Structure formats: structure tokens, C-alpha cells
């Protein structure tokens, strides 16, 4: 497994958009956009879990520094952490 941090996101980026992006490289088991507790609105970052570490590292290597919906991605291995 690998937990992937995705950040500097267009605030319109949804969980399904993150899954859509990362599932191109391998199986995705979880996708979460972190939101403001009161407004419920995206804070511009989230986490995607992929079942295969090798596919996750591949996704990070390909996606590094690419723009997504008008903003340069932050895409990096995250600390494995429960929700
Ligand atoms: Ca690990």
C-alpha cells in the first residue's frame, strides 16, 4: 500500500477527480479531499491510497510537476495513517 499526498489543488477538484487521475496507474482504494470543518469546502489538498506501492511510486514520478486543472500538482508519498 501507499498513501499519496495531493496538494495545491484547484478548489474545484473533487475526490472522484483524484481517483480518476491516480487510478490510471493502478488500483485505488481510498480518496479523500480535506475540507474546512465549518464550510465543508475543499482546503486544496487530500490523500489517495493505492494498493500497490510500485504503481504509487510510478504515479508520483509521472505526475511530478505537472499542472492539473490549472495548478501545479503537489504529489508525494505520505505517512501511512488511519483516517
Ligand atoms: Ca511504505
Automatic annotation (TrEMBL):
Supply the Pfam families for this chain. RRM_1
Indicate yes or no for the key word Transcription regulation.
no
Kindly indicate whether the keyword Nucleus belongs to this entry: no
Classify the source by domain of life.
Bacteria
Indicate which residues the UniProt annotation says bind Ca(2+).
Answer: 53
Q: Keywords on this record?
A: Calcium, Metal-binding, RNA-binding
Which Gene3D superfamilies does the record associate with it?
A: 3.30.70.330
List the SUPFAM superfamilies.
Answer: RNA-binding domain, RBD
Limits of the RRM domain: 2-80
GO MF terms listed in the record are: metal ion binding; RNA binding
Indicate what this protein is called per its UniProt record.
RNA-binding protein
Q: Can you name the source organism?
A: Porphyromonas gingivalis (strain ATCC BAA-308 / W83)
